[PDB]
């Protein structure tokens, strides 16, 4: 699906800067064009109004290039006269993307006066004034609800001479009111246009004379976590390789032994082996538990799957980036086969076949012919545990050897040999190594996002959404390795990779607080190192906010914590902490669902209005906003929060 031009914002440089919009495409025209990538319409003007079938935003032409934000456009092609125009430039680090301007493009020219008085052209052809306060920041002379600014990202920031100063990126809010705007300065575009680009870093960086962070992008199975570290060790260095799967980490032992005659150290929360070898294999979690970097222990640290966006991986990489040099490493390598900006492409030996409506097994609105999974080894990804159990039972009743697997079940349930259909969630990646004759992908995932609702503080939501490129490549990747494979899907879509939500940041502080004895202040130092490093997944910078919130959650109750940790829930700390507040006031929990079992015992002694701390789910009980901690987090909501538009 390409992005398509659906209109434009026409500006005037005569007299004062004024604008007006002119819609040119309809919804049916927008969808057909989006699907074909073939747009015959003639672009005109510098500011284009664009849409993606899901979202709509602005696109502004400057120096031959039509630019817009990565968060809105992803890595999509632009609909063009002769077909889809693939992107000329892509800078996820700058939230910046470009395409070669179409014949009818006028473009803008970069400002050269250095005027701090700016005008932002919004999608409703509104021109609102802004005073530059930074190289990439400006304050609105008149605060406005964010809502007003949404849908205008990608729009220009102009100087009085009507020249381009930058493109609108994000809004800086205070209790939801936009006070300043965030933009990609035109200079970041020059640099971006000059950036060296076919950039091949598919080879093991040479360890430098002085500390350096290097990237290593190589296809899956190119030996980034085995062949590479082995070669490094032959040269005399001590190597630490970090991975997010407990299963994979354990697996490197036998494999390394046989393929490289190296008997590595293995470190996981379930098992560690210290051989004394010069190569160590560890999970980010276990690395975080060991206390992070040990001085003088390693010359090279290879962060495998550095595109992974779970909190443990980000905190873990953040730790490596913050302390690796001071502990004596010369080289930190960030390796992945799918860096930020990746799109899934055809696999030579994997046949991709769309699932139709015929077949005896219903699957997300489509069907699975039983002939495709009777006999053989097949893997079926579902977005939830409920689904996994439902499907595994449907199949079992049909006589097909089916088994479900997800967080909590022992991998023991998956048989390693013989016919089976495995019904699983993404938990499968850390729990199981193994390939399949085929994989069927529902193409959806469950994700969490923070909503700064002010009812009374914030909310962490759980919704099921369209998988992104790395998800689809990891799922499809369980077939096709050294064997011919089949990948069947519900939908062909794929959302842009390389981005993650602020709730993942919140999870880092929770993990730092519940497992790693990390104070909110040390967690920030590490997350900051992560955010300051280019080439890694990106997210809004809400470190201060998140740190301020957890900083106030003092004297949790060990017993509750213990139980929320044992349970293996998503935010053991925040849950355990709400629970403790409830207890120090005989107040019942926000509700009585699974999430609050750690209080269950006392159900009969608990009543009154639960003093709500934040919203972690349905609040069936009445609530009170008077508790001191609740007021504190309430005050934490007045912080400056940058949110995308």
Query: Catalytic amino acids?
Result: 71, 95, 153
Q: Is 159 in the site for Zn ion (CB under 5 A)?
A: yes
Residue 231, judged by CB atoms within 10 A of its CB (0-12, 13-18, 19+), counts as middle
Q: Is 143 in the site for its own copies (CB under 8 A)?
A: yes
Q: What are the residues whose beta carbons fall under 8 Å from the beta carbon of 344, sequence distance 6 or more?
A: 469, 472, 473, 476, 494
Q: Is 476 in the site for Zn ion (CB under 5 A)?
A: no
- With CB under 5 A as the contact rule, which of the stretches 159-167, 329-337, 442-450, 480-488 interacts with Zn ion? 159-167
Instruction: Please tell me whether 254 is known to bind a ligand.
Output: no
Q: Is 161 in the site for Zn ion (CB under 5 A)?
A: yes
Phi, psi of 163 (to 5 degrees): -100, 155
Instruction: Supply the minimum distance, in Å, between the C-beta of residue 12 and its own copies.
Output: 11
Q: Of the two residues 268 and 444, which places its CB atom closer to its own copies in the complex? A: 444
Beta bridge partner(s), residue 405: 424
Instruction: Please tell me whether 217 is known to bind a ligand.
Output: no
Instruction: Please tell me whether 508 is known to bind a ligand.
Output: no
Residue among 7, 37, 498, 535 that touches its own copies (CB under 8 A):
7
Q: Is 221 in the site for its own copies (CB under 8 A)?
A: no
Q: Which does residue 365 touch among Zn ion, its own copies, none (CB within 5 to 8 A, set by kind)?
A: its own copies
* C-alpha triplet 320, 324, 327: angle, nearest 5°: 140
Q: Within the chain, what is the greatest distance between any pair of CA atoms?
A: 78
Instruction: Supply the minimum distance, in Å, between the C-beta of residue 153 and Zn ion.
Output: 22
Rg of the chain in Å (alpha carbons): 26
Q: Which does residue 21 touch among Zn ion, its own copies, none (CB within 5 to 8 A, set by kind)?
A: its own copies
Q: Which does residue 27 touch among Zn ion, its own copies, none (CB within 5 to 8 A, set by kind)?
A: its own copies
Q: Which does residue 275 touch among its own copies, Zn ion, none (CB within 5 to 8 A, set by kind)?
A: none
Beta bridge partner(s), residue 380: 423, 440
Q: How far apart are CA 280 and CA 242, in angstroms?
A: 8
Nearest to 505, CA basis, from 291, 244, 309: 309
Instruction: Please tell me whether 45 is known to bind a ligand.
Output: no
Q: Say if residues 582 and 622 touch (Cβ distance below 8 Å).
A: no
Separation in Å, CA 396 to CA 200, 391, 407, 623, 630: 48, 9, 21, 45, 49
Structure tokens at 378: 């097949």
Instruction: Please tell me whether 303 is known to bind a ligand.
Output: no
The H or E element spanning position 210 is none
Structure tokens at 78: 């632009």
Q: How far apart are CA 645 and CA 638, in angstroms?
A: 19
Q: Which does residue 163 touch among Zn ion, its own copies, none (CB within 5 to 8 A, set by kind)?
A: Zn ion
Q: Which does residue 454 touch among its own copies, Zn ion, none (CB within 5 to 8 A, set by kind)?
A: its own copies
Q: Of the two residues 176 and 434, which places its CB atom closer to its own copies in the complex? A: 176
Instruction: Supply the minimum distance, in Å, between the C-beta of residue 228 and its own copies.
Output: 44
Nearest to 234, CA basis, from 277, 295, 294: 277
Q: Of the two residues 161 and 532, which places its CB atom closer to Zn ion in the complex? A: 161
Q: In degrees to the nearest 10, what's the CA dihedral of 604, 607, 610, 611?
A: -110
Q: Which does residue 495 touch among Zn ion, its own copies, none (CB within 5 to 8 A, set by kind)?
A: none
77: left (phi over 0), alpha (psi -120 to 50) or beta: beta
Instruction: Please tell me whether 412 is known to bind a ligand.
Output: no
Q: Which does residue 113 touch among its own copies, Zn ion, none (CB within 5 to 8 A, set by kind)?
A: Zn ion
Q: Is 158 in the site for Zn ion (CB under 5 A)?
A: no
Q: Of the two residues 23 and 209, which places its CB atom closer to its own copies in the complex? A: 23
Q: Is 42 in the site for its own copies (CB under 8 A)?
A: no
Residue among 38, 144, 481, 528 that touches its own copies (CB under 8 A):
144
Residue whose token pair is 């005989």: 586
Residue among 81, 369, 434, 456 that touches its own copies (CB under 8 A):
456
Instruction: Please tell me whether 159 is known to bind a ligand.
Output: yes
Instruction: Supply the minimum distance, in Å, between the C-beta of residue 134 and Zn ion.
Output: 17
Q: Of the two residues 396 and 453, which places its CB atom closer to its own copies in the complex? A: 453
Q: Of the two residues 159 and 392, which places its CB atom closer to Zn ion in the complex? A: 159
Instruction: Please tell me whether 224 is known to bind a ligand.
Output: yes
**Interface map 52-81 toward its own copies (x if CB under 8 A):** -x----------------------------
Q: How far apart are CA 352 and CA 487, in angstroms?
A: 5
Residue 169, judged by CB atoms within 10 A of its CB (0-12, 13-18, 19+), counts as buried
**Interface map 108-137 toward Zn ion (x if CB under 5 A):** ---x-x------------------------
Q: How far apart are CA 509 and CA 527, in angstroms?
A: 9
The H or E element spanning position 564 is helix 558-567
Q: Of the two residues 463 and 605, which places its CB atom closer to its own copies in the complex? A: 463
Q: Which does residue 409 touch among Zn ion, its own copies, none (CB within 5 to 8 A, set by kind)?
A: none
How are beta strands 96-100 and 272-273 bridged, if at all? unpaired
Instruction: Please tell me whether 221 is known to bind a ligand.
Output: yes
Instruction: Please tell me whether 220 is known to bind a ligand.
Output: yes
Q: What are the residues whose beta carbons fall under 8 Å from the beta carbon of 454, sequence distance 6 or more?
A: 175, 176, 637
Q: Is 22 in the site for its own copies (CB under 8 A)?
A: yes
CB burial readout 141-157, b (16+ within 10 A) else e: eeeeebebbbbbbbbbb
- With CB under 5 A as the contact rule, which of the stretches 118-126, 138-146, 153-161, 250-258 interacts with Zn ion? 153-161
Contacting positions for Zn ion (CB under 5 A): 111, 113, 159, 161, 163
Contacting positions for its own copies (CB under 8 A): 7, 10, 20-24, 27-28, 31-32, 35, 53, 143-145, 174-175, 177, 357, 362, 364-367, 453-456, 618-620, 622, 625, 638
């Amino acid at each position: 699906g390409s992005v398509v031009i659906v209109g434009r914002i026409i500006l005037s440089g005569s007299g004062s800067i004024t604008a007006y919009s002119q819609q040119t495409r309809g919804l049916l025209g927008c969808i057909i064009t989006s699907l074909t990538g073939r747009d015959k319409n003639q672009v005109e003007g510098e500011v284009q109004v664009v849409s993606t079938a899901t979202q709509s935003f602005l696109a502004t032409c400057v120096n031959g290039v039509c630019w817009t934000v990565y968060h809105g456009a992803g890595s999509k092609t632009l609909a063009g006269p002769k077909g889809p125009i693939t992107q000329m430039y892509t800078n996820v680090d700058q939230d910046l993307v470009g395409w070669q301007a179409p014949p009818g493009a006028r473009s803008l020219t970069p400002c050269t006066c250095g005027s701090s008085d700016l005008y932002l052209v919004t999608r409703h052809a509104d021109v609102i004034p802004v005073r530059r306060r930074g190289d990439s920041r400006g304050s609105l002379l008149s605060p406005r609800p964010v809502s007003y600014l949404k849908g205008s990202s990608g729009g220009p920031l102009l100087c009085p001479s009507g020249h381009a100063v930058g493109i609108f990126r994000a809004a800086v809010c205070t209790r939801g009111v936009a006070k300043a705007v965030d933009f990609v300065p035109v200079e970041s575009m020059e640099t971006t246009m000059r950036s060296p680009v076919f950039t091949d870093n598919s080879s093991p960086p040479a360890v430098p004379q002085s500390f350096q962070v290097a990237h290593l992008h190589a296809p899956t199975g190119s030996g980034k976590s085995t062949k590479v570290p082995a070669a490094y060790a032959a040269q005399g260095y001590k190597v630490l390789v970090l991975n997010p799967s407990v299963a994979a980490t354990l697996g490197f032992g036998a494999y390394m032994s046989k393929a490289h005659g190296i008997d590595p150290n293995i470190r996981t929360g379930v098992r560690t082996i210290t051989t004394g070898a010069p190569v160590t294999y560890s999970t980010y979690g276990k690395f975080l538990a060991d206390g992070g970097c040990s001085g003088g222990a390693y010359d090279i640290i290879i962060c495998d799957e550095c595109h992974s966006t779970d909190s443990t991986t980000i905190l873990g990489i953040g730790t490596v980036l913050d302390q690796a040099e001071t502990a004596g490493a010369r080289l930190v390598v960030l390796a992945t086969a799918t860096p930020p900006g990746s799109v899934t492409v055809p696999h030579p030996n994997i046949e991709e076949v769309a699932l139709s409506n015929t077949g005896e097994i219903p699957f997300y609105g489509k069907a699975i012919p039983i002939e495709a999974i009777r006999g053989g080894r097949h893997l079926i990804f579902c977005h939830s545990k409920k689904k996994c159990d439902e499907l595994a039972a449907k199949l079992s009743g049909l006589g097909i050897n089916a088994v479900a697997y997800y967080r909590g079940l022992d991998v023991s349930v998956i048989p390693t040999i013989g016919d089976v259909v495995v019904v699983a969630t993404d938990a499968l990646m850390t729990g199981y190594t193994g390939d399949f004759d085929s994989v069927i992908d529902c193409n959806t995932c469950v994700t969490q996002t923070v909503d700064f609702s002010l009812d009374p503080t914030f909310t962490i939501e759980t919704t099921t959404v369209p998988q992104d490129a790395v998800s689809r490549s990891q799922r499809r990747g369980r077939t096709g390795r050294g064997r011919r494979g089949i990948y069947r899907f519900v939908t062909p879509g794929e959302r842009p990779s390389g981005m993650f939500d602020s709730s993942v940041l919140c999870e880092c502080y929770d993990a730092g607080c519940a497992w790693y004895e990390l104070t909110p202040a040390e967690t920030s130092v590490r997350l900051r190192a992560y955010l300051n490093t280019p080439g890694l997944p990106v997210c809004q910078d809400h470190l201060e906010f998140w740190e301020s919130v957890f900083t106030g959650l003092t004297h949790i109750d060990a017993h509750f914590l213990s139980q929320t940790k044992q349970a293996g829930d998503n935010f053991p700390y925040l849950v355990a902490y709400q629970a403790t507040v409830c207890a120090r006031a005989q107040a019942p929990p926000p509700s009585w669902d699974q999430m609050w079992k750690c209080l269950i015992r006392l159900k009969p002694t608990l009543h009154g209005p639960t003093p709500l701390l934040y919203r972690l789910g349905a609040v069936q009980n009445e609530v009170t906003l008077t508790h001191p901690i609740t007021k504190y987090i309430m005050a934490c909501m007045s912080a400056d929060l940058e949110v995308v538009t």
